[PDB]
Design an enzyme around this catalytic site. Structure first.
Site, PDB file in Angstrom:
ATOM      1  N   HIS A 193       0.804  -1.219   0.000  1.00  0.00           N
ATOM      2  CA  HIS A 193       0.000   0.000   0.000  1.00  0.00           C
ATOM      3  C   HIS A 193       0.835   1.265   0.000  1.00  0.00           C
ATOM      4  O   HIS A 193       0.273   2.357  -0.100  1.00  0.00           O
ATOM      5  CB  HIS A 193      -0.927   0.065   1.221  1.00  0.00           C
ATOM      6  CG  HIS A 193      -1.951  -1.014   1.249  1.00  0.00           C
ATOM      7  ND1 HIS A 193      -2.810  -1.243   0.197  1.00  0.00           N
ATOM      8  CD2 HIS A 193      -2.255  -1.931   2.197  1.00  0.00           C
ATOM      9  CE1 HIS A 193      -3.594  -2.263   0.488  1.00  0.00           C
ATOM     10  NE2 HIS A 193      -3.276  -2.698   1.696  1.00  0.00           N
ATOM     11  N   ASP A 209      -2.293 -10.902  -2.079  1.00  0.00           N
ATOM     12  CA  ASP A 209      -2.900 -10.288  -0.909  1.00  0.00           C
ATOM     13  C   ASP A 209      -4.333  -9.883  -1.246  1.00  0.00           C
ATOM     14  O   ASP A 209      -4.617  -9.424  -2.351  1.00  0.00           O
ATOM     15  CB  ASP A 209      -2.078  -9.059  -0.510  1.00  0.00           C
ATOM     16  CG  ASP A 209      -2.505  -8.465   0.810  1.00  0.00           C
ATOM     17  OD1 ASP A 209      -3.513  -7.721   0.847  1.00  0.00           O
ATOM     18  OD2 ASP A 209      -1.808  -8.730   1.806  1.00  0.00           O
ATOM     19  N   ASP A 233      -4.049 -12.813   3.725  1.00  0.00           N
ATOM     20  CA  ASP A 233      -5.345 -12.378   4.239  1.00  0.00           C
ATOM     21  C   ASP A 233      -6.523 -12.784   3.352  1.00  0.00           C
ATOM     22  O   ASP A 233      -7.668 -12.513   3.734  1.00  0.00           O
ATOM     23  CB  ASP A 233      -5.363 -10.852   4.469  1.00  0.00           C
ATOM     24  CG  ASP A 233      -4.658 -10.078   3.381  1.00  0.00           C
ATOM     25  OD1 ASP A 233      -4.336 -10.688   2.339  1.00  0.00           O
ATOM     26  OD2 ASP A 233      -4.443  -8.855   3.560  1.00  0.00           O
TER      27      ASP A 233
HETATM   28  O1  LIG Z   1      -3.699  -6.202   5.070  1.00  0.00           O
HETATM   29  C1  LIG Z   1      -3.815  -5.126   4.545  1.00  0.00           C
HETATM   30  N1  LIG Z   1      -3.380  -4.915   3.217  1.00  0.00           N
HETATM   31  O2  LIG Z   1      -2.854  -5.925   2.659  1.00  0.00           O
HETATM   32  C2  LIG Z   1      -4.452  -3.962   5.218  1.00  0.00           C
HETATM   33  C3  LIG Z   1      -3.981  -2.680   5.369  1.00  0.00           C
HETATM   34  O3  LIG Z   1      -4.899  -1.924   6.030  1.00  0.00           O
HETATM   35  C4  LIG Z   1      -5.936  -2.770   6.251  1.00  0.00           C
HETATM   36  C5  LIG Z   1      -7.135  -2.308   6.988  1.00  0.00           C
HETATM   37  C6  LIG Z   1      -7.081  -1.146   7.752  1.00  0.00           C
HETATM   38  C7  LIG Z   1      -8.212  -0.732   8.452  1.00  0.00           C
HETATM   39  C8  LIG Z   1      -9.362  -1.489   8.372  1.00  0.00           C
HETATM   40 BR1  LIG Z   1     -10.937  -0.905   9.355  1.00  0.00          BR
HETATM   41  C9  LIG Z   1      -9.434  -2.644   7.618  1.00  0.00           C
HETATM   42  C10 LIG Z   1      -8.302  -3.062   6.925  1.00  0.00           C
HETATM   43  N2  LIG Z   1      -5.738  -4.001   5.801  1.00  0.00           N
HETATM   44  K   LIG Z   2      -3.751  -8.022  -4.282  1.00  0.00           K
HETATM   45 ZN   LIG Z   3      -3.978  -7.237   2.785  1.00  0.00          ZN
END
Ligand SMILES: O=C(NO)c1coc(-c2ccc(Br)cc2)n1
Ligand SMILES: [K+]
Ligand SMILES: [Zn+2]
Ligand SMILES: [K+]
Length: 354
Positions: free
Chosen positions: A133, A171, A264
């Site tokens: 990200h 992911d 995930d």
């Molecule tokens: O694993 C992740 N990316 O691969 C990831 C990064 O931020 C989040 C997330 C943040 C807040 C909330 Br509410 C839900 C998800 N997930």
């Molecule tokens: K992805």
């Molecule tokens: Zn993720």
């Protein structure tokens, strides 16, 4: 052939001091590492040393302003750390965050170097914090620097500028940073599979939809496979690989494959809500090994069920080590719709698509 593995427990120092239970836990990587020992996978691997990325290497993908602000967190007080992290979307920072992100990147650089110089055929990188990200100029979603993107540029830096790199991002979330970093780049093919829900799933941008196919010379070199309305699992991911990922990858003919390997999308993960099984990840890994003369680097991204990610990533390492794929239903309508939308968008660019 030799499989490398890199893991350094110092990446556990990065922590959330206002929520000790935050899902991006230090124990993510220690649990994965311990499972590699329990299953006798670690002893079969060549152990690759970790290292810090340098500031000049961070500059392959990130602006000086972004490197400067994250580096400055190393000497901040708790109140300053809380304020800075709340300036970003879904970030927490500790005084060790910067060095841990440097270690995650440099560990992957050493791993890419080992693959490209022939020390090992392929490798797995048990690293945190995650990377995909992270944008050129911003931290986001538990990520400070884009480890996978940096590793692609690092690999080109130690080989040639036009080295063809495929980044497969499985992911469950869209790697907005990786797409943006390489959006205009025809030397790095970015393919992401992600839960989308019409733009209402983190990171919550329509940049993740199937019709973002790249810009400029990079048109066609960005492949988004967005999922909508469904708890996708092994059948959907296998079908996406069959119809899209593997045909396009073969036409691109990468010389190096990096996997932004969040886990995930695994069953058990509350953040992803999907049900990809450890054996499913084994089959995706095994398919990718047919590319780039087997030059595959698996890079941990997200993944938050400690047992699920330990089991899933272990299965990937088993495949890299040469073990036989384990034993592994028609698709949902909306999965078919998603795959057909990507096929229509990318048919102009990839003549092998059917
Ligand atoms: O694993 C992740 N990316 O691969 C990831 C990064 O931020 C989040 C997330 C943040 C807040 C909330 Br509410 C839900 C998800 N997930
Ligand atoms: K992805
Ligand atoms: Zn993720
Ligand atoms: K690209």
């Amino acid at each position: 052939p030799i499989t490398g593995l890199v893991y350094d427990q110092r990446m556990m120092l990065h922590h959330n001091m206002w929520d000790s239970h935050h899902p991006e836990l230090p124990q993510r990587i220690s649990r994965i590492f311990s499972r590699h020992e329990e299953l006798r996978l670690l002893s079969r691997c060549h152990r690759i040393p970790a290292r810090l990325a340098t500031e000049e290497e961070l500059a392959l993908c990130h602006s000086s302003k972004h490197i400067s602000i994250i580096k400055s967190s190393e000497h901040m007080k708790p109140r300053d750390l809380n304020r800075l992290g709340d300036e970003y979307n879904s970030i927490f920072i500790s005084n060790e965050s910067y060095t841990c992100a440097l270690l995650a990147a440099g560990s992957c650089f050493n791993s890419a170097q080992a693959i490209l110089t022939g020390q090992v055929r392929n490798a797995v990188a048990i690293v945190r914090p995650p990377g995909h990200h992270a944008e050129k100029d911003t931290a986001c979603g538990f990520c400070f620097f884009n480890t996978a993107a940096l590793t692609a540029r690092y690999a080109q830096s130690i080989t040639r500028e036009s080295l063809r790199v495929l980044i497969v991002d499985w992911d469950v979330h869209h790697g907005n940073g990786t797409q943006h970093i390489f959006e205009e780049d025809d030397s790095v093919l970015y393919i992401s599979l992600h839960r989308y829900e019409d733009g209402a799933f983190f990171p919550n941008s329509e940049d993740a939809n199937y019709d973002k196919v790249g810009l400029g010379k990079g048109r066609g070199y960005n492949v988004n496979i967005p999922w909508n309305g469904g708890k996708m699992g092994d059948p959907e991911y296998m079908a996406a690989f069959h119809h899209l990922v593997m045909p396009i990858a073969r036409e691109f003919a990468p010389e190096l494959v990096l996997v932004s390997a969040g886990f995930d999308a695994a069953r058990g993960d509350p953040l992803g809500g999907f049900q990809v099984t450890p054996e499913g990840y084994a089959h995706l890994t095994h398919q990718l090994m047919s590319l780039a003369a087997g030059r595959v680097l698996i890079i941990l991204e997200g993944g938050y069920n400690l047992t699920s990610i330990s089991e899933s990533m272990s299965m990937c390492t088993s495949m890299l080590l040469g073990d036989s794929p384990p034993s592994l239903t028609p698709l949902k309508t909306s999965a078919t719709v998603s795959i057909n939308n990507v096929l229509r968008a990318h048919a102009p660019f990839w003549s092998s698509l059917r």
